[PDB]
A paper describes a structure:
Phylogenetic analysis indicates that AKRtyl is the founding member of subfamily D within family 12 in the AKR superfamily. Specifically, by combining steady-state and transient kinetics, X-ray crystallography and molecular dynamics simulation, we demonstrate that AKRtyl exhibits a positive synergy mediated by an unusual Monod-Wyman-Changeux (MWC) paradigm of allosteric regulation at low concentrations of the cofactor NADPH, but an inhibitory effect at high concentrations is observed.
The other set of purified state structure contains two complete octamers (16 subunits) in each asymmetric unit with two and four NADP(H)s all bound to the same tetrameric side, respectively. Unlike the first purified state structure, the two tetramers in each octamer of this structure exhibit different but regular features. All subunits of cofactor-bound tetramers behave similarly to the first purified state structure in which the functional loops are clear and ordered. We further confirmed these structural features is not resulted from crystal packing. Noteworthy, the disordered conformation actually represents an ensemble of various non-functional conformations in which the disordered loops in the crystal structure oscillate randomly, so we consider this conformation to be dormant, and the subunits of cofactor-bound tetramers belong to the active conformation with ordered and suitable structural features, and the multiple conformations of AKRtyl suggest conformational plasticity. To summarize, the eight subunits in the first purified state structure all belong to the active conformations, while the second structure contains half active and half dormant conformations which coincidentally camped based on conformational states to form tetramers. Upon further analysis, in both structures, we found that the dormant tetramers have no NADP(H) bound but the active tetramers bound at least one NADP(H). This regular characteristic suggests that the binding of NADPH induces the transformation of the conformation of the entire tetramer to be active.
Author numbering:
A (entry chain H): 1 to 91, 93 to 224, 226 to 229, 251 to 255, 257 to 331
B (entry chain B): 1 to 230, 244 to 246, 249 to 251, 256 to 331
C (entry chain E): 1 to 22, 29 to 52, 60 to 86, 96 to 230, 246 to 331
D (entry chain A): 1 to 20, 28 to 52, 61 to 87, 89, 96 to 231, 244 to 255, 257 to 331
E (entry chain F): 1 to 224, 226 to 229, 247 to 331
F (entry chain C): 1 to 21, 30 to 50, 60 to 70, 72 to 88, 96 to 230, 244 to 245, 247 to 331
The structure:
Amino acid sequence: MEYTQLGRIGLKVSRLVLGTMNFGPTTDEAESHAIMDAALDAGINFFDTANVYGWGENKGRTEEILGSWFAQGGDRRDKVVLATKVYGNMGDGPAWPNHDKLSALNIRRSVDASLKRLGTDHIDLYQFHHVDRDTPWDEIWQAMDVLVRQGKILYVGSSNFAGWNIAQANETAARHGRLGLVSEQCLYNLCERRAEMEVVPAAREYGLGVIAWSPLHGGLLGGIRKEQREQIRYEDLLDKHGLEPGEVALAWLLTRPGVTGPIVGPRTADQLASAVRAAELTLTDEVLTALDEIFPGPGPSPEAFAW
Amino acid sequence: MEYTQLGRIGLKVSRLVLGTMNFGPTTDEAESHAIMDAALDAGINFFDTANVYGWGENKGRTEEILGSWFAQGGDRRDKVVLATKVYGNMGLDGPAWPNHDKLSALNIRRSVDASLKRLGTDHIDLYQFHHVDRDTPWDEIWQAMDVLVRQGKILYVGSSNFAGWNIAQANETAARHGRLGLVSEQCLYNLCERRAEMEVVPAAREYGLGVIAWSPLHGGLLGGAIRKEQDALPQQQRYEDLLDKHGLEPGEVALAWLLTRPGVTGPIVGPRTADQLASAVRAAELTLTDEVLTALDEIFPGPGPSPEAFAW
Amino acid sequence: MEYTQLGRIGLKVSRLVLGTMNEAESHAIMDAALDAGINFFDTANVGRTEEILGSWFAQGGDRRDKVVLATKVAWPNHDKLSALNIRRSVDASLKRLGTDHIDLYQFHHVDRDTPWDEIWQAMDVLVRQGKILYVGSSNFAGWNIAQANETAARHGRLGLVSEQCLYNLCERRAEMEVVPAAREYGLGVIAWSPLHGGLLGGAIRKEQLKDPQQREQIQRYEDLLDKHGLEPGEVALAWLLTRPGVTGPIVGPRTADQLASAVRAAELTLTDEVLTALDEIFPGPGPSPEAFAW
Amino acid sequence: MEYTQLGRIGLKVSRLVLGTDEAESHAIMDAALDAGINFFDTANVRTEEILGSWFAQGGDRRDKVVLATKVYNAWPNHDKLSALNIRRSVDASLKRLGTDHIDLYQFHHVDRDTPWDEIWQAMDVLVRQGKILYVGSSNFAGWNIAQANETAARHGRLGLVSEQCLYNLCERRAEMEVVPAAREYGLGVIAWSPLHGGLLGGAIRKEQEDALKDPQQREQIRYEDLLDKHGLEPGEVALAWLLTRPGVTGPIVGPRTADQLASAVRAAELTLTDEVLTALDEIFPGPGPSPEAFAW
Amino acid sequence: MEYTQLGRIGLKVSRLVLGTMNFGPTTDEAESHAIMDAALDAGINFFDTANVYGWGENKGRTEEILGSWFAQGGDRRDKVVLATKVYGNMGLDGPAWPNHDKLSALNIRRSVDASLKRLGTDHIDLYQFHHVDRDTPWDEIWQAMDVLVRQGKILYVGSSNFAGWNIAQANETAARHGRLGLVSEQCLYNLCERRAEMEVVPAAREYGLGVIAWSPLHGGLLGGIRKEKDPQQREQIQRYEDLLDKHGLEPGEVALAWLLTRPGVTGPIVGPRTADQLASAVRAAELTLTDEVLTALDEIFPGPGPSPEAFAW
Amino acid sequence: MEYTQLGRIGLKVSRLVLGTMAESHAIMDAALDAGINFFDTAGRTEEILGSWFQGGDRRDKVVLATKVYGAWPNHDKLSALNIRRSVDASLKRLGTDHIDLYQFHHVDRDTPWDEIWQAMDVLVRQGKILYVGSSNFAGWNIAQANETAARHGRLGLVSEQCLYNLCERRAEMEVVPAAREYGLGVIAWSPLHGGLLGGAIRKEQDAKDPQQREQIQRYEDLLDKHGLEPGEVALAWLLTRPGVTGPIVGPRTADQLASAVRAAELTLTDEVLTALDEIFPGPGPSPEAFAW
Ligand SMILES: NC(=O)C1=CN([C@@H]2O[C@H](COP(=O)(O)OP(=O)(O)OC[C@H]3O[C@@H](n4cnc5c(N)ncnc54)[C@H](OP(=O)(O)O)[C@@H]3O)[C@@H](O)[C@H]2O)C=CC1
């Protein structure tokens, strides 16, 4: 298992990040637990969840499933970097005022509900699930600082931010000796590469980790075999090279400059073992060039659209 | 029900603010609760109170009534943006024992603790200065407020009855050291009294505060007083006849007016009864047309911003 | 001659400010101002006034050295407070004035479209080139003063040292917020049109602008001063000199007599009953929020 | 002639930006002045020396324009944004322009190798000498605008006041990040190449006498037909559209004839209908802001 | 009873400060309690104590006595501004164990915890440094105090026995990081000893500190010979006793009342053993000294005024 | 010649400062050759130094100290206005393009430190001035001034000139402790107390008072008892005090200079110091001086 620093900070994390979205909705509590135990045995120390995970009326169930996993003892809590999220409505449909988004009010009520479901007295990485254009950064950093100084959270990360939101966030934190965002969780994969224009550049300038969510573009790059689509040629290129598609999509992300790693979302213990193999592939220079021609990326702005 | 950001901050509030000063001294506990439950159903999430509401010997009774409202559960506390105030003397009226009114750190500490206990909650969402205290410096005030912010006992700080230059001094002092400044100003603003337009509202708009107008009916005067001779206040009627003309109620139009004023978050509506609430609710969605505004403006001329309002 | 510090700063100025009048007769007035001990000269008028001061300094004899010189700042950017307009205005002013520095350089009016970091950029360029010493405002709201000086203090800069506001017996609404702000932040207050355009100069007696009930209060005014043997021109000035935070009024004498009167107004002590009576005739609003709430 | 504040600052400019032999340009600058255009830019659609001699004719020409120039695409330190190149480039520009100050001094392109404390040192030397009033950018990413202006504010310096970016009906990707950042930070947005090098100024009709070679490209350039159906000229509608976009100060126009000037002036006066806007949007789709543009 | 702001801050205090040094070592618990209820009845809201008050093996007795006073309910705690001190050795007199005196963050933590426990309250209003400690840097002291401010354990910080430049340095250092600095200096100031006027009081006034005068009677030396050292100093006590007999003034009341005329002075510490001494202090507050008396007092007891003039020009 | 860092800064100065009163030029050149580099004007004095700056690297070898020179409003005191006019007049009179140590003549309680530092920073940034010092300040004025400078990255006061000698030791209460905390050099002005400590009684052969004659006599006798000249001992006493850079001295001949030089080289005995301390006791620091 390969380890890296999470951007500029002192935290070391596995280059595979255990996504937990499926835990509860598509995978039951006991199988969720055994996937997590198997991640630990594979050296994966970095678990991503969110409050809203679970579905509809069962929002929070994923957090509860991790909660009962930690409750089994065995140094499970001590061993994981636990990451969750705040922004979402925990109620489905339109929200009551201040029960979503990033007001100090919603942050205060969200983190308490999360800590209670997770059965733990602290979150290691608390992440904004999305940018909230209506909350100013002095309000956001005030709320996060309350939680940091109480020992309730350690680090703060973003998800689905623009590059300039990362800049504004971290410049604002630094001005008053706050540690700013330590990571951005962004949609990045072979099919969708527009994060290269500004998000990954800003994150690397500011020393954020980059965690790629939906690394398989929600299954689309993990093998039609179970059946614009010309591209998904990829499959044929891999049949030719004897490479499994889910593995290549993951390993490809591990080659991208500044990417901490993908968030893997395995339903099964076997889907996990597949991801673990993906961290050990070494895609050849030939395969890289082909994959580039099938799935071109814009590269950084302003060149992506100008010169 | 219309919502807006409270000035520049992430907080979303109803453009009607439930005033509560009648809960206790005129309206009783069980009915106060009925009004508040009615406001929630109307989508009103923003409740204003103070420590001093209850009057005379029953100062703090209103805070206690909201306390028992929350104690009934049903997500009442969780759904409400709870605002109260500090500054007022909480002992029997007349001259205060020193540091038992105004805005020393000493009084802020004793007041918030007494309020939280009466309100039966662990935090106030918006804690407001009830008035400016010229004798307390902002480094002292922000120290006190920041202790409360970092313990999780308050989220936001707001002002009431400030001068525009007090708002600037407050927020520039907060910003210099990281702190979120004032997020709202509660000022006296209606058709009769528009001098908050000279400086208080421009300062608030510059600094990104929400503006909450208290006494939106100038103490009844604009809620059909002439037609209820069937405080005292000469040349202080054409208003009523213009509304009788146009087929509008006096109390509804006074509120609908403040809602068109630039930078105004909304009025503090202070119903004694349930139908007076629903009357406020109708005012929220009322639409004053270009013509009646011009008329109302002609009857109640405003000064507009300083220095123009007295100079050029 | 009565002196005060200009607000919080170390500059000492006469409590009479010599404004602009209407070439050889201006020079005579300015020399007589000097000999009366007036050292604070302003070009206050909401091009040639600067030139007249400049020809005054060319005579030598320590006229520039003895004087605190104060001045102020349509085709786009030829008005208002952009850094661009500020540079072109000061350059012209320095050429018209025939001096290499302005002592107090004032904004004419609040410009709600220029941010304070742009304004202080432009002012700091001039300060550090030695072309200006201090900065003041005119026709600001109270909160503009607070904003301006809070922004200045953040980066070590001396902020506004003076506000020039319309302030006289008839118009007292500067007392609501402008003067309190100015006192909080230690700005000198310079009262413009102290006589209210002549209206308090005893202009019923000169009849041998405004006349509904403004007339009645001006009559009750002249009458009171008749009954006390005090000149109307003198009293309106001396009243401002009793107001907390006021440095002094801008006076523009064109004759030796008008100067001599202003000088007498500075040495005039008004009794408590005069003041109580002027206050009855000419009520002030007091400070916000008390002026209009509690 | 419509004026706007440049971004958040107190400078007012014409919403047309006058970009770029000696006698011909000297004459059309004088007519731009007379049409109310005060914003003169040395970006193209020796240039500085032409402007130089124009001022040299007296007549309050310098006093009436906002002058905008750029740092000069190789010997080390003769390109890019080191303090060294800034010093040699501004000095050369002031001599050429025959003036003692530039109103807007712009960067030509983000330089990833120069840190912002070095750039602002250099700009600040020039600000404090009176040599420059404001600083602007060209071809930045959104986050470069954020980092620059957050670095300037930290030490009391005014930051970037403007960004000049490629923006027109055909290239709307400045709308993802560059334009939202500019708006957050109060930069005026100056649209460079507003007619896409010619393509949006009746290019198909002008064939009856770039790459129209690709079939999907020319099918969009439907635009000409829509404008015929409403009786509007393309060279004008391309400019007027940009003037409706949030945050845009104005486009850079390079008129040479009286007719190009008169037509530019008309485009600044043209109010387009919601129907045409909606119609132009269907043809020329915008990406929306990030992260919505590609995530949610 | 006359009130004033404590320097520049919003706190309003009586111009008489109740000293408690006698509560425990001479006055017993029960009579102390009666003097404190009597002080409250006179409108005196400002109570000064110290950890070391009690002397010898009984250090801390005074704080315990105020603690038992608060425990009697009746809004006693809620009505006073409670001030105590840190710096002093709380063990056996004679050289302290290292870090058991002075102003280390270590000694500040243990002293405050012990004071709060003895005082039987969760917070002190004014926590004062009993003396300057030149060995502790201000970034350490303000860290220590800010910890207590943010826990709600103290509100305000004050000094005692500082030099003027210590006041400036402390507050400049606090202001640098948004901390309220010292709100008050408790300095030795009275008729025989006016050298605080040189720099201490000018510095306090510039920085907006309250000035509280301790030893207001120079240890009884200005409270009346008539109950009976250096011949040139007994000389000036006689001229002072002689002058107040002539005007029918009690020397105890004038020494206090004189301090209330000095610019920048909040008020004196009055330290009663008995109820009659307290009533006497209250009458000292109501007294209006005449210009003749002030000018004669000044004639007897000259001050230096401020530096640099006091020694140069 | 003994040299020292001036307070905390990198400038090295002689522990003798050359105060002021064609003959002048000669004693200045003599002082140079004696190794004295620190020249202090403490008008006209300035005009004379300017004519000296004849060439021969004269300006280049000296640390040139002057004063603000402090009536018509704003022709005294420390407003930005008066600072600008005094410095310009001083640079013209001194015939040089920069002053090394520009000093305030007194504390001005009416000018705030943000105004003062604006004026000095202007001058610093134009290269007209390198360092700023004070004269006749209180300790807290030093503290306030230097805290205000440092908040904005400005070098603060680097020296205080205070009245300091055996007779008048009250600078030790607070002025000298503040100076030492903030790393200012202390320049002792009037080191002989107007002439009283330079053998005044034997010159008899300002103060009739028998209490201070008493004191001078015990000093003069003690100096005969150990065969030491008072004009030298009064200088040498100050050079032993903590934080003292050195005294100002104004020798007019080859022979007075050479007595100054010897005072700077003379070690005083611990016995003579204990004896000088008994005759001329010091107040000690505040608050101990008057509290505990
Ligand atoms: N911040 C945000 O906005 C969001 C963040 N996330 C985070 O990122 C994580 C990943 O998102 P998700 O969409 O699940 O990611 P993927 O794109 O990896 O989708 C996972 C799915 O792909 C298939 N799959 C998983 N592992 C393998 C494998 N090793 N080989 C082949 N196929 C495989 C399975 O689909 P099948 O059903 O066919 O078996 C599985 O359910 C989440 O768990 C969450 O923590 C995700 C979405 C939103």
